[PDB]
């Protein structure tokens, strides 16, 4: 495929460099239209710029710490860090959020990879052989309430068990109710004066609960669980203006008050280089 | 081969719009608006197609472009909720789907200078001025035919009014990715943008959701000749097109 | 060779090779050819 | 009720977005079946799928 | 050859009416309602056909038939002016044309006795009770969904309420020339009358003129068994059919 | 496979919505039998509801 | 490809694709067609 065509002198009443950008069309003017060029080839296909490649590499989406300790003298096992819950969303990390939020609608198959790492900040004599349970709680299912709750039996809910230090990896089909995920929603849950804007069950993938299924020991081990998401079979619609300002909340377009200027002011006048 | 391109006219129902200083009309994503086909449909209720009774041009109250005006924002279909039979059908039916032919008009003399960016943003989800996790109340996001003036002050529970950050955290110079047209007073008096139905679902609630948001933003400020009034009128004309309604039910109740 | 039953288990589809920027660069009603006057 | 008894009832389904009906005139504005109770002892009114989104949550 | 005729059901739009004690439905002048053809049309504005959004059954407030009730009268399309999208289109368009499927219901036990004459009169021009040359005021001739009760007293500028003289100077026994059906409680619980558009013009004003007038008049008085309540409920159900609207314009203003 | 068939106005002596549930049969009445519907497809097979999957 | 000798070692059979709810919804001696009177 030719990138630049061979082109000589021009003396014509057709002027390809003059146009009206007011029409909303960006004319496909080529280097050969402003000056005289030689024939050269593209010798490139653009595989690394495909939407499947731009969104199809792993990025961390959640990090959480859980502890193996006795549940005696505790009223809340989640506040004791014996188990932890994650409202599934891809908007907690700004590096991934800005790439994905560059389109209005995206439809993709997910691939989760969970990395659990152990740590003994307090006195321990050996590296404990802990097994972590990651439980998917779809909307409507009972979220675990205790580290040894009846919910963890998981008679129907998907659940994965793996050794701490190692990793687990499972694929998830497109779970949205609509034909594509909504990255933005200019609307509400119901016709109400006080209801939530944008954040609504349109962006509710469900929840994931994490616990150490091993019994409690004599030593405290803090396990940092890291969830990574990699998209497959990605499709995207309605490209959008890129995010410029820092974020403030998940699922909402707000930015901080008194924010710093985003345009990098030049040193000198408009004529300096 | 003698002809001109600045003269074009659009007739929808019993209304006709004529122009003598037009830039080529824009069709969003090169796709003309169309009725929902059987291969994509979800709700089984047979859709009501009102044709010429709703598919016609409605003029919205004119805005005054001053040398210090920041810009203007309208939400669709909310901006047409009080417009004739379209406004009633939109509240009497549970679900609706519609494309639109937007026509913005701003006429001036051969001595005036200034340029407007007329752009349509699908799901233009607004940011509150309070930051953090604060939500925009329904009453500020659904103003109706009077729209949102970006020149006004911020309000409690309202959206942010900094036009440069597009009320959502993106810069104004990047809005050109969305279907847009410029009303450069030196070249044009009218922008025109034909919008198809843009949503992730085939048909949807018209009272809870705005599919697109129309923004008219002055880029080059209004420069009037010496001794002329430092103000110019802007009229926005919108026509529903290829409209579908489904699920008739008692009239819908909304805030205010 | 696919080692699982579901399509969601598969690897990426590679690249959509047929591209056309015109629907984003020139979404205009009348078609405009470069060199001819945009307006007349 | 008895074989010599009679009643005419209106089954009305109101799609989402609208208030729960307060009168028959308000309910009759929506999807409805007028049922004459007679030899056939049972009425069967099918609630048509009225939704924008392809799937609703059970919860 | 085993079948029954008392069971019939009518589905219009999203509404369905079922019956188990019906008399064969009547079609006025053996002519089913139809759209205005090009060979008869006068106004050149292309007509709006709203189909399933207006062509469905609307129930009017039930009336109570007592042993001393004289009868009831409704005017069309006036009786449907507050009924959903039909009521709005009827006021938003300058001209309209429509047929109707009228279904009157009055259920009772196997011990009750009485008979209603359900009749449709085209141009049922009412007489004032004052005689001479006095006119009936618009407000008394256009009551809406609550209709005219013939059991009530006469009013200043109002129509006459003597049912026997049909409120116009003809006798009740002669109303059988107009499309009619009897609800004989011994035989039937429902009357049904399909009306085509009846006018001397192809399309007409829906706010100034009533094309037909529906009268429900008890001939044999209500005879309840010993110890039962001396009252029975009557519900009238009307559906616009083969409806046409033309000449859209700002919403029409009427008295009261 | 069609989910809902295209269906217009009904004026008939056959009434599919009236039945006798006393017979122990649940009649296969469709949305198209109570109101007027458009043609739409199932575009779903029901693999997650199989007894082998449940 | 099966890696073992027994049928009990195999993966699931997928779905029984031919379904018929009539044996549970209408287990009646005489066949009843919708629209015709259930009883006469």
- For residue E174, give the CATH number of its domain: 2.60.120.20
Q: Domain tally for chain B?
A: 1
Strands B58-66 and B231-248: antiparallel
Q: Which phi-psi region, left, alpha or beta, contains residue B247 (left: φ > 0; alpha: ψ -120 to 50)? A: left
Evaluate whether chains A and E are touching (3 or more beta carbon pairs less than 8 Å apart).
no
Comparing CA positions, the residue from A142, A154, A140 lying closest to residue A201 is A140
First to last CA, chain A: 36
Could you tell me how many CB contacts below 8 A there are between chain A and chain D? 15
Strands A222-229 and F18-19: unpaired
Tell me the C-alpha distance between B153 and B139, whole Å. Answer: 16
Range of the domain at E88: 8-248
Using an 8 Å Cβ cutoff, are A115 and A124 in contact?
A: no
B49 interface with E at CB cutoff 8 Å = yes
Tell me the C-alpha distance between A187 and E136, whole Å. Answer: 52
> Residues of D near E (CB-CB distance < 8 A)?
4-8, 10, 24-25, 28-40, 43, 45, 48
Comparing CA positions, the residue from E98, E208, A190 lying closest to residue B254 is A190
F1 interface with G at CB cutoff 8 Å = no
What is the signed CA dihedral for A249, A253, A256, A262, rounded to 10 degrees? 130
- Work out the minimum CA distance from F49 to partner chain B, whole angstroms: 20
Three-class secondary structure of residue B73 per DSSP: strand
Q: Which helix (H) or strand (E) holds A119?
A: strand A103-119
Three-class secondary structure of residue E203 per DSSP: coil
| E254 domain residue, yes or no | no
Evaluate whether chains C and D are touching (3 or more beta carbon pairs less than 8 Å apart).
no
Using an 8 Å Cβ cutoff, are F16 and F33 in contact?
A: yes
Q: Which helix (H) or strand (E) holds B9?
A: strand B8-12
Strands D42-43 and F2-4: unpaired
Chain-centre distance of CA A142, in angstroms? 26
Chain-centre distance of CA E249, in angstroms? 27
F34 interface with B at CB cutoff 8 Å = no
C-alpha triplet D21, D25, D29: angle, nearest 5°: 75
Tell me the C-alpha distance between B172 and B167, whole Å. Answer: 10
| B41 domain residue, yes or no | yes
B63 interface with A at CB cutoff 8 Å = no
Using an 8 Å Cβ cutoff, are B246 and D50 in contact?
A: yes
Using an 8 Å Cβ cutoff, are D26 and D44 in contact?
A: no
Domains of chain A by residue range = 1-273
G12 interface with F at CB cutoff 8 Å = yes
Using an 8 Å Cβ cutoff, are E76 and E123 in contact?
A: no
Using an 8 Å Cβ cutoff, are A184 and B123 in contact?
A: yes
Question: Between G13, G19, G34, which is nearest F29 by CB?
Answer: G34
A140 interface with D at CB cutoff 8 Å = yes
Tell me the C-alpha distance between E98 and E33, whole Å. Answer: 8
Comparing CA positions, the residue from A42, A35, A28, A30 lying closest to residue A10 is A35
Q: What residue of B is the nearest CA neighbor of F9?
A: B46
- Work out the minimum CA distance from B106 to partner chain E, whole angstroms: 26
Q: Which helix (H) or strand (E) holds F31?
A: helix F31-34
E2 interface with G at CB cutoff 8 Å = yes
- Work out the minimum CA distance from G38 to partner chain D, whole angstroms: 7
Using an 8 Å Cβ cutoff, are E83 and B79 in contact?
A: no
Comparing CA positions, the residue from A65, A89, A74, A82 lying closest to residue A139 is A89
Comparing CA positions, the residue from G4, G22, G24, G2 lying closest to residue G13 is G2
C-alpha triplet B104, B106, B109: angle, nearest 5°: 155
Tell me the C-alpha distance between B208 and A192, whole Å. Answer: 9
**Residue E221 β-bridge partners:** none
Residue B128: DSSP 8-state: B
Q: What residue of A is the nearest CA neighbor of C7?
A: A173
């Amino acid at each position: 495929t030719v990138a630049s065509i061979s082109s000589g002198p021009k003396h014509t009443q057709k002027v390809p460099i003059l146009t009206a950008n007011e029409t909303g069309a960006t004319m496909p003017v080529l280097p050969s239209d402003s000056i005289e060029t030689r024939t050269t080839y593209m010798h490139f296909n653009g595989s690394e710029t495909d939407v499947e490649c731009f969104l199809g590499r792993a990025a961390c989406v959640h990090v959480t710490e859980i502890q193996n300790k006795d549940a005696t003298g505790i009223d809340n096992h989640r506040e004791a860090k014996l188990f932890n819950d994650w409202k599934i969303n891809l908007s907690s990390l700004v590096q991934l959020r800005k790439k994905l939020e560059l389109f209005t609608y995206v439809r993709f198959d997910s691939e989760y990879t969970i990395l659990a790492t152990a740590s003994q900040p307090d006195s321990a004599n050996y590296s404990s052989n802990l097994v972590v349970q990651a439980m998917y709680v779809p909307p409507g299912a009972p979220n675990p309430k205790e580290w040894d709750d009846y919910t963890w039996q998981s008679a129907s809910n998907p659940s994965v068990f793996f050794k701490v230090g190692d990793t687990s990896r499972f694929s998830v089909p497109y779970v949205g109710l609509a034909s594509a995920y909504n990255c933005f929603y200019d609307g509400y849950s119901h016709d109400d004066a006080e209801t939530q804007y944008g954040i609504t069950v349109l962006n509710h993938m469900g929840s994931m609960a994490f616990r150490i299924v091993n019994e409690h020991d004599e030593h405290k081990t803090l396990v940092k669980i890291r969830v990574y998401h990699r998209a497959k079979h990605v499709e995207a619609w309605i490209p959008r203006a890129p995010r410029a300002l820092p974020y403030t909340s998940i699922g909402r377009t707000n930015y901080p008050k008194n924010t710093e200027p985003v345009i990098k002011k030049r040193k000198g006048d408009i004529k300096s280089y | 081969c003698g002809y001109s391109d600045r003269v074009q006219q659009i007739t929808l129902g019993n209304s006709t719009i004529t122009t003598q200083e037009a830039a080529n009309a824009v069709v969003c994503y090169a796709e003309w608006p169309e009725y929902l086909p059987d291969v994509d449909a979800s709700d089984v209720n047979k859709t009501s197609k009102p044709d010429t009774s709703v598919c016609r041009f409605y003029t919205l109250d004119s805005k005054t472009w001053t040398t210090g005006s920041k810009g203007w924002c309208w939400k669709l279909p909310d901006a047409l909720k009080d417009m004739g039979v379209f406004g009633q059908n939109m509240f009497f039916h549970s679900l609706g789907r519609s494309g639109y032919t937007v026509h913005v008009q701003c006429n001036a003399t051969k001595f005036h200078s200034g340029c407007l960016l007329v752009v349509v943003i699908p799901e233009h989800q607004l940011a509150s001025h309070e930051g953090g996790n604060v939500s925009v109340k329904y009453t500020f996001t659904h103003p109706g035919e009077r729209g949102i003036d970006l020149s006004s002050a911020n309000e409690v529970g309202g959206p942010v009014k900094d036009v440069i950050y597009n009320m959502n955290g993106t810069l104004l110079g990047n809005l050109l990715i969305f279907p847009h047209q410029f009303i450069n007073l030196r070249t044009n008096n009218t922008a025109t943008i034909v919008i198809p139905y843009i949503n992730s679902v085939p048909i949807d609630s018209m009272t809870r959701h705005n599919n697109v948001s129309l923004m008219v933003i002055p880029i080059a400020p209004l420069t009037v000749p010496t001794g002329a009034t430092p103000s110019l009128p802007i009229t926005v004309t919108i026509a529903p097109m290829c409209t579908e309604f489904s699920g008739i039910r008692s009239k819908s109740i909304v805030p205010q | 060779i696919n080692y699982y039953k579901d399509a969601a288990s598969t690897s990426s589809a590679g690249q959509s090779l047929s591209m056309d920027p015109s629907k984003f660069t020139e979404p205009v009603k009348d078609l405009m050819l470069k060199g001819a006057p945009a307006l007349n | 009720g008895p074989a010599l008894s009679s009643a005419k009832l209106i089954l009305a389904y109101t799609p989402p977005g609208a208030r729960g009906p307060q009168d028959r005139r308000e309910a009759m504005l929506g999807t409805h079946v007028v049922w004459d109770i007679g030899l056939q002892s049972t009425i069967v009114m099918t609630i048509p799928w009225t939704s924008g989104v392809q799937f609703r949550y059970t919860d």
